[PDB]
C-alpha cells in the first residue's frame, strides 16, 4: 500500500590499511537502486534498478558528487568521534547512518528520519518531530550542540519533507511495473522421508516481492503454529525472495497437512498439499 525510500550509509575506518571505506546503498521498499563504493577504481554512483538508470548524466553525476562529498565528511566524522571518546589512533571503527521517508498510498509524508550509530551502537538520531535530536551519550551531545547550532534539523527536515518524497514519487512512477506490482510466489511442496514411518514436507514460496510474506501449516484444518519449522526470508539474488516452512509427519497421512501462503501478489491466500507423482 504505502511505500518508502531508505538510504544506508556505512563509513568504516582502517587505521593502517589506508583510509575510511565509505559505502552507501539506496532502496525504495525492498528494491535497491543506488550503490556507491569509496574503493572502486572509479568511485562513482551506480544504478541497480531499471527505473533509476533511465535518468541521465547530470543526475548520476550530481548524485556522485554527493556520495564523494559524503564520505569526505564521514572521514572527518570518524576522526572526530575517535576523539570524542578519546580512543586509539590505530583502533578501527564504524559510523552507520539510516535516513529516508515513509509515505501514504496517496503520497504525503507519514514519518521521516535520520539516525546514526557508532560501532553498531545507537549514537544520535533525528527525532520524529523533525526538529530535535536524541543523543545516546555525552559524546553525541557534542555533536548535537554543533548540529543544533548548525540547524541541521531545519535542513534535513526540508529534504525529508521536501525532496525525499518527490524523489520517491518519481521512482515509484517510473518503476510502477515493479515496485507498485506484486509478483506472487511460485509455490510447491517437497517430500523427504526422514526416519522410518516419518516424512518431512517443505512448502516453498520463491521469487516473490515484497519480502513480506506468510507461510503456515495446517493438519486437518488446525494451525500447527507450534511444529511449523521455517527459515528466515532470504534474497533469491535477483531482486526476488525465498522462504519455506516444514513439519514432520506420519507417512501416508501426508494429505492431511496443507500449506498456506499469504502474499500481496496473491488475490486470495494459497492452500496447497503435496502432489505425489502418480
Amino acid at each position: 500500500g504505502s511505500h518508502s525510500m531508505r538510504y544506508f550509509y556505512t563509513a568504516v575506518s582502517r587505521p593502517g590499511r589506508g583510509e575510511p571505506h565509505f559505502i552507501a546503498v539506496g532502496y525504495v521498499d525492498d528494491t535497491q537502486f543506488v550503490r556507491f563504493d569509496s574503493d572502486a577504481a572509479s568511485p562513482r554512483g551506480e544504478p541497480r534498478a531499471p527505473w533509476v538508470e533511465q535518468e541521465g548524466p547530470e543526475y548520476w553525476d550530481r548524485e556522485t558528487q554527493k556520495y564523494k562529498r559524503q564520505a569526505q565528511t564521514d572521514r572527518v566524522s570518524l576522526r572526530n568521534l575517535r576523539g570524542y571518546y578519546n580512543q586509539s589512533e590505530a583502533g578501527s571503527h564504524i559510523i552507520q547512518r539510516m535516513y529516508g521517508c515513509d509515505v501514504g498510498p496517496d503520497g504525503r509524508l507519514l514519518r521521516g528520519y535520520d539516525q546514526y550509530a557508532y560501532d553498531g551502537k545507537d549514537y544520535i538520531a533525528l527525532n520524529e518531530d523533525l526538529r530535535s535530536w536524541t543523543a545516546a551519550d555525552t559524546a553525541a551531545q557534542i555533536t548535537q550542540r554543533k548540529w543544533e547550532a548548525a540547524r541541521e534539523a531545519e535542513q534535513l527536515r526540508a529534504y525529508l519533507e521536501g525532496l525525499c518524497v518527490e524523489w520517491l514519487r518519481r521512482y515509484l512512477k517510473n518503476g510502477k511495473e515493479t515496485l507498485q506490482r506484486a509478483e506472487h510466489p511460485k509455490t510447491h511442496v517437497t517430500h523427504h522421508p526422514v526416519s522410518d514411518h516419518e516424512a518431512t514436507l517443505r512448502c516453498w514460496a520463491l521469487g516473490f516481492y515484497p519480502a513480506e510474506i506468510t507461510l503456515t501449516w495446517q493438519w486437518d484444518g488446525e494451525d500447527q503454529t507450534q511444529d511449523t519449522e521455517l527459515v528466515e526470508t532470504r534474497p533469491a539474488g535477483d531482486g526476488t525472495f525465498q522462504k519455506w516452512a516444514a513439519v514432520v509427519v506420519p507417512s501416508g497421512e501426508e494429505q492431511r497437512y496443507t500449506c498456506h501462503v499469504q502474499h500481496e501478489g496473491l488475490p486470495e491466500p494459497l492452500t496447497l498439499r503435496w502432489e505425489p507423482s502418480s
Partner: protein, 100 residues
C-alpha cells in the same frame, strides 16, 4: 566494541537440478563489525568467479551480504560456504542441501 555472529544460509536462486545452470548463494546476516571473509566452495575448495551484493544493514544495525556465483550442480558435486568473522573461533563451513 559490541559484536554479533553471522546467521548463514546456503541456497540456489532457482530450484536446484543437475545439468542446469543456477546460482549458489550464501546469505550472511546479523553480523557486526562488517569485515568478513565469505568463501564459496566446490568439492572441498574455493571457487573464483564469486561476487557479493553491496554492503547494507538492518534496523538493529546488523549488516548483511549475499554472495553468489553461477553454477551447474551435479549429483556428484558438493558445494559449501565458508565464513570467517572476528566473532567466530574458526571458519564455520556450511554445506549445500538443495532440499533446504
Amino acid at each position: 566494541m559490541i559484536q554479533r555472529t553471522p546467521k548463514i544460509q546456503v541456497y540456489s536462486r532457482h530450484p536446484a537440478e543437475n545439468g542446469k545452470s543456477n546460482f549458489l548463494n550464501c546469505y550472511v546476516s546479523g553480523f557486526h563489525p562488517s569485515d568478513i571473509e565469505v568463501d564459496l566452495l566446490k568439492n572441498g575448495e574455493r571457487i573464483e568467479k564469486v561476487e557479493h551484493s553491496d554492503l547494507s544493514f538492518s534496523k538493529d544495525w546488523s549488516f548483511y551480504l549475499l554472495y553468489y556465483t553461477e553454477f551447474t550442480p551435479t549429483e556428484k558435486d558438493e558445494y559449501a560456504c565458508r565464513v570467517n568473522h572476528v566473532t567466530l573461533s574458526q571458519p564455520k563451513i556450511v554445506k549445500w542441501d538443495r532440499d533446504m
